Nucleic acid binder design. Sequence first.
DNA 1: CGCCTTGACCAGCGC
DNA 2: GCGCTGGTCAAGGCG
Length: 78
Amino acid sequence: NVSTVYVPTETSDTSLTVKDGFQWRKYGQKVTRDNPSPRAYFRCSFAPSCPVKKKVQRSAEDPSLLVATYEGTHNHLG
DNA sequence: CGCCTTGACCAGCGC
DNA sequence: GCGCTGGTCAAGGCG
Ligand SMILES: [Zn+2]
């Protein structure tokens, strides 16, 4: 259902942008008590017809990876 | 227009 | 009840 994706990214790209075939609207960004890097919160470009939610944050275990986390599935292709 | 920012809002969950 | 934590709002700008 809610999948997870680890993406190698240079540590200078601090945008937390993960290209994944969809476009997204950013609705927040917060630091969490276990990772001193920010977590970005997105929703699908097809919201609210689409329920997919998105989180991107740099892995605390491997700083060379971003972690992208999704919730739900789309109803489109674009 | 629409997206990003950022601090404020929230609620729920463990005591 | 209550402090904490992540998740979300919604206002102020800006390409
Ligand atoms: Zn979608």
